[PDB]
mmCIF file of all heavy atoms in Angstrom:
data_model
loop_
_atom_site.group_PDB
_atom_site.id
_atom_site.type_symbol
_atom_site.label_atom_id
_atom_site.label_comp_id
_atom_site.label_asym_id
_atom_site.label_seq_id
_atom_site.Cartn_x
_atom_site.Cartn_y
_atom_site.Cartn_z
ATOM 1 N N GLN A 91 13.780 26.972 -16.061
ATOM 2 C CA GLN A 91 13.323 28.139 -15.331
ATOM 3 C C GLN A 91 14.024 28.252 -13.988
ATOM 4 O O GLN A 91 14.119 29.356 -13.439
ATOM 5 C CB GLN A 91 11.802 28.073 -15.126
ATOM 6 C CG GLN A 91 11.161 29.357 -14.617
ATOM 7 C CD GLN A 91 11.109 29.424 -13.100
ATOM 8 O OE1 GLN A 91 11.132 28.397 -12.421
ATOM 9 N NE2 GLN A 91 11.040 30.637 -12.563
ATOM 10 N N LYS A 92 14.528 27.131 -13.466
ATOM 11 C CA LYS A 92 15.384 27.154 -12.290
ATOM 12 C C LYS A 92 16.641 27.971 -12.545
ATOM 13 O O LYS A 92 17.260 28.459 -11.592
ATOM 14 C CB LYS A 92 15.750 25.727 -11.879
ATOM 15 C CG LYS A 92 14.548 24.824 -11.627
ATOM 16 C CD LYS A 92 13.651 25.314 -10.500
ATOM 17 C CE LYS A 92 14.344 25.258 -9.152
ATOM 18 N NZ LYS A 92 13.433 25.725 -8.069
ATOM 19 N N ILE A 93 17.035 28.114 -13.815
ATOM 20 C CA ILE A 93 18.134 29.008 -14.173
ATOM 21 C C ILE A 93 17.846 30.414 -13.665
ATOM 22 O O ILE A 93 18.716 31.080 -13.089
ATOM 23 C CB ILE A 93 18.350 29.003 -15.697
ATOM 24 C CG1 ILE A 93 18.495 27.575 -16.219
ATOM 25 C CG2 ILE A 93 19.565 29.837 -16.071
ATOM 26 C CD1 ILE A 93 18.765 27.490 -17.704
ATOM 27 N N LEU A 94 16.617 30.886 -13.881
ATOM 28 C CA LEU A 94 16.210 32.179 -13.346
ATOM 29 C C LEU A 94 16.257 32.174 -11.825
ATOM 30 O O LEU A 94 16.731 33.135 -11.206
ATOM 31 C CB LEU A 94 14.808 32.530 -13.847
ATOM 32 C CG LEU A 94 14.175 33.834 -13.358
ATOM 33 C CD1 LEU A 94 15.004 35.024 -13.800
ATOM 34 C CD2 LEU A 94 12.746 33.957 -13.861
ATOM 35 N N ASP A 95 15.771 31.096 -11.204
ATOM 36 C CA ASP A 95 15.820 30.992 -9.749
ATOM 37 C C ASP A 95 17.257 30.953 -9.244
ATOM 38 O O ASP A 95 17.586 31.589 -8.234
ATOM 39 C CB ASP A 95 15.057 29.751 -9.286
ATOM 40 C CG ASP A 95 13.587 29.803 -9.644
ATOM 41 O OD1 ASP A 95 13.156 30.813 -10.239
ATOM 42 O OD2 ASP A 95 12.864 28.834 -9.330
ATOM 43 N N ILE A 96 18.130 30.210 -9.930
ATOM 44 C CA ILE A 96 19.535 30.166 -9.537
ATOM 45 C C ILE A 96 20.183 31.532 -9.709
ATOM 46 O O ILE A 96 20.926 31.995 -8.834
ATOM 47 C CB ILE A 96 20.283 29.080 -10.332
ATOM 48 C CG1 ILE A 96 19.886 27.687 -9.838
ATOM 49 C CG2 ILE A 96 21.790 29.288 -10.245
ATOM 50 C CD1 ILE A 96 20.371 26.566 -10.726
ATOM 51 N N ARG A 97 19.899 32.211 -10.823
ATOM 52 C CA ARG A 97 20.469 33.537 -11.026
ATOM 53 C C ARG A 97 19.924 34.539 -10.017
ATOM 54 O O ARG A 97 20.642 35.461 -9.615
ATOM 55 C CB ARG A 97 20.226 34.009 -12.459
ATOM 56 C CG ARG A 97 21.144 33.343 -13.471
ATOM 57 C CD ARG A 97 20.838 33.782 -14.887
ATOM 58 N NE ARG A 97 21.778 33.208 -15.843
ATOM 59 C CZ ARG A 97 21.768 33.457 -17.145
ATOM 60 N NH1 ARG A 97 20.870 34.263 -17.687
ATOM 61 N NH2 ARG A 97 22.684 32.885 -17.921
ATOM 62 N N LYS A 98 18.667 34.379 -9.597
ATOM 63 C CA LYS A 98 18.152 35.203 -8.508
ATOM 64 C C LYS A 98 18.943 34.967 -7.228
ATOM 65 O O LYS A 98 19.170 35.901 -6.450
ATOM 66 C CB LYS A 98 16.669 34.918 -8.279
ATOM 67 C CG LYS A 98 15.735 35.609 -9.258
ATOM 68 C CD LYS A 98 14.285 35.277 -8.942
ATOM 69 C CE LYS A 98 13.324 35.991 -9.880
ATOM 70 N NZ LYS A 98 13.353 37.468 -9.694
ATOM 71 N N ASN A 99 19.371 33.723 -6.991
ATOM 72 C CA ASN A 99 20.193 33.440 -5.819
ATOM 73 C C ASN A 99 21.535 34.156 -5.907
ATOM 74 O O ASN A 99 21.993 34.761 -4.930
ATOM 75 C CB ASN A 99 20.397 31.931 -5.665
ATOM 76 C CG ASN A 99 19.143 31.218 -5.198
ATOM 77 O OD1 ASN A 99 18.779 30.168 -5.727
ATOM 78 N ND2 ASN A 99 18.473 31.788 -4.204
ATOM 79 N N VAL A 100 22.174 34.110 -7.078
ATOM 80 C CA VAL A 100 23.438 34.819 -7.260
ATOM 81 C C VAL A 100 23.243 36.311 -7.040
ATOM 82 O O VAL A 100 24.055 36.968 -6.377
ATOM 83 C CB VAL A 100 24.027 34.522 -8.651
ATOM 84 C CG1 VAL A 100 25.276 35.355 -8.888
ATOM 85 C CG2 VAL A 100 24.339 33.043 -8.788
ATOM 86 N N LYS A 101 22.159 36.871 -7.583
ATOM 87 C CA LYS A 101 21.874 38.286 -7.367
ATOM 88 C C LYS A 101 21.561 38.572 -5.907
ATOM 89 O O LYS A 101 22.032 39.569 -5.351
ATOM 90 C CB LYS A 101 20.712 38.730 -8.255
ATOM 91 C CG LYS A 101 20.249 40.158 -8.008
ATOM 92 C CD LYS A 101 18.903 40.415 -8.670
ATOM 93 C CE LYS A 101 18.374 41.803 -8.343
ATOM 94 N NZ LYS A 101 19.189 42.877 -8.962
ATOM 95 N N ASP A 102 20.779 37.701 -5.265
ATOM 96 C CA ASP A 102 20.433 37.916 -3.864
ATOM 97 C C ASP A 102 21.661 37.838 -2.967
ATOM 98 O O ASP A 102 21.816 38.649 -2.045
ATOM 99 C CB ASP A 102 19.384 36.899 -3.419
ATOM 100 C CG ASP A 102 19.051 37.012 -1.944
ATOM 101 O OD1 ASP A 102 18.975 38.149 -1.433
ATOM 102 O OD2 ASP A 102 18.873 35.961 -1.291
ATOM 103 N N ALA A 103 22.553 36.880 -3.227
ATOM 104 C CA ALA A 103 23.716 36.703 -2.365
ATOM 105 C C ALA A 103 24.640 37.912 -2.435
ATOM 106 O O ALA A 103 25.026 38.471 -1.402
ATOM 107 C CB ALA A 103 24.464 35.425 -2.744
ATOM 108 N N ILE A 104 24.992 38.340 -3.649
ATOM 109 C CA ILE A 104 25.929 39.450 -3.782
ATOM 110 C C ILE A 104 25.295 40.751 -3.301
ATOM 111 O O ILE A 104 25.984 41.610 -2.735
ATOM 112 C CB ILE A 104 26.436 39.558 -5.234
ATOM 113 C CG1 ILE A 104 27.573 40.578 -5.327
ATOM 114 C CG2 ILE A 104 25.306 39.929 -6.185
ATOM 115 C CD1 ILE A 104 28.765 40.236 -4.461
ATOM 116 N N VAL A 105 23.985 40.917 -3.497
ATOM 117 C CA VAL A 105 23.310 42.120 -3.020
ATOM 118 C C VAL A 105 23.294 42.155 -1.498
ATOM 119 O O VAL A 105 23.554 43.196 -0.884
ATOM 120 C CB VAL A 105 21.887 42.207 -3.604
ATOM 121 C CG1 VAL A 105 21.002 43.078 -2.731
ATOM 122 C CG2 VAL A 105 21.932 42.750 -5.024
ATOM 123 N N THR A 106 23.004 41.016 -0.866
ATOM 124 C CA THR A 106 22.936 40.980 0.589
ATOM 125 C C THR A 106 24.296 41.232 1.224
ATOM 126 O O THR A 106 24.375 41.872 2.280
ATOM 127 C CB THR A 106 22.370 39.636 1.052
ATOM 128 O OG1 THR A 106 21.088 39.426 0.442
ATOM 129 C CG2 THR A 106 22.224 39.604 2.565
ATOM 130 N N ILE A 107 25.374 40.756 0.595
ATOM 131 C CA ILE A 107 26.697 40.910 1.191
ATOM 132 C C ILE A 107 27.189 42.349 1.061
ATOM 133 O O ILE A 107 27.715 42.925 2.021
ATOM 134 C CB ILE A 107 27.687 39.911 0.562
ATOM 135 C CG1 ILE A 107 27.260 38.476 0.868
ATOM 136 C CG2 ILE A 107 29.105 40.169 1.055
ATOM 137 C CD1 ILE A 107 28.173 37.432 0.265
ATOM 138 N N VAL A 108 27.014 42.959 -0.116
ATOM 139 C CA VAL A 108 27.513 44.319 -0.303
ATOM 140 C C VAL A 108 26.715 45.305 0.537
ATOM 141 O O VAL A 108 27.261 46.307 1.015
ATOM 142 C CB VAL A 108 27.511 44.713 -1.792
ATOM 143 C CG1 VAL A 108 28.338 43.731 -2.609
ATOM 144 C CG2 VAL A 108 26.092 44.797 -2.320
ATOM 145 N N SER A 109 25.419 45.052 0.732
ATOM 146 C CA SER A 109 24.631 45.929 1.585
ATOM 147 C C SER A 109 24.960 45.722 3.055
ATOM 148 O O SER A 109 24.718 46.621 3.867
ATOM 149 C CB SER A 109 23.138 45.700 1.346
ATOM 150 O OG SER A 109 22.713 44.476 1.919
ATOM 151 N N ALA A 110 25.523 44.566 3.409
ATOM 152 C CA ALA A 110 25.886 44.302 4.794
ATOM 153 C C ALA A 110 27.246 44.882 5.159
ATOM 154 O O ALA A 110 27.492 45.160 6.339
ATOM 155 C CB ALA A 110 25.870 42.796 5.062
ATOM 156 N N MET A 111 28.135 45.074 4.176
ATOM 157 C CA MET A 111 29.496 45.514 4.483
ATOM 158 C C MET A 111 29.517 46.832 5.245
ATOM 159 O O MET A 111 30.435 47.073 6.038
ATOM 160 C CB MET A 111 30.325 45.655 3.205
ATOM 161 C CG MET A 111 30.569 44.371 2.442
ATOM 162 S SD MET A 111 31.734 44.612 1.084
ATOM 163 C CE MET A 111 30.959 45.964 0.200
ATOM 164 N N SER A 112 28.525 47.693 5.025
ATOM 165 C CA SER A 112 28.471 48.991 5.681
ATOM 166 C C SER A 112 27.463 49.050 6.822
ATOM 167 O O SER A 112 27.459 50.036 7.569
ATOM 168 C CB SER A 112 28.150 50.087 4.657
ATOM 169 O OG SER A 112 26.893 49.861 4.045
ATOM 170 N N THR A 113 26.619 48.029 6.980
ATOM 171 C CA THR A 113 25.645 47.993 8.064
ATOM 172 C C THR A 113 26.035 47.042 9.188
ATOM 173 O O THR A 113 25.428 47.096 10.262
ATOM 174 C CB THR A 113 24.265 47.595 7.529
ATOM 175 O OG1 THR A 113 24.369 46.365 6.803
ATOM 176 C CG2 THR A 113 23.723 48.674 6.621
ATOM 177 N N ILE A 114 27.015 46.169 8.960
ATOM 178 C CA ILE A 114 27.546 45.330 10.024
ATOM 179 C C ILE A 114 28.420 46.174 10.949
ATOM 180 O O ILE A 114 29.044 47.155 10.526
ATOM 181 C CB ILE A 114 28.319 44.149 9.406
ATOM 182 C CG1 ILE A 114 27.342 43.120 8.835
ATOM 183 C CG2 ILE A 114 29.249 43.496 10.403
ATOM 184 C CD1 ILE A 114 26.209 42.768 9.777
ATOM 185 N N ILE A 115 28.450 45.811 12.228
ATOM 186 C CA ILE A 115 29.235 46.546 13.218
ATOM 187 C C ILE A 115 30.245 45.615 13.881
ATOM 188 O O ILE A 115 29.849 44.683 14.599
ATOM 189 C CB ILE A 115 28.321 47.208 14.258
ATOM 190 C CG1 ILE A 115 27.398 48.211 13.573
ATOM 191 C CG2 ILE A 115 29.137 47.902 15.328
ATOM 192 C CD1 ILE A 115 26.245 48.624 14.429
ATOM 193 N N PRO A 116 31.558 45.819 13.677
ATOM 194 C CA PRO A 116 32.148 46.868 12.837
ATOM 195 C C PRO A 116 32.000 46.605 11.341
ATOM 196 O O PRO A 116 31.936 45.448 10.929
ATOM 197 C CB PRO A 116 33.624 46.850 13.247
ATOM 198 C CG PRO A 116 33.862 45.469 13.710
ATOM 199 C CD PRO A 116 32.592 45.049 14.391
#
Side-chain angles (χ1 to χ4, degrees):
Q91 191 270 336
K92 304 299 294 181
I93 308 182
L94 178 62
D95 298 359
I96 287 169
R97 284 177 176 182
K98 280 181 178 294
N99 288 135
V100 175
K101 174 194 176 68
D102 176 39
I104 189 60
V105 157
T106 304
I107 296 179
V108 303
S109 74
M111 296 188 306
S112 61
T113 54
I114 285 313
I115 298 165

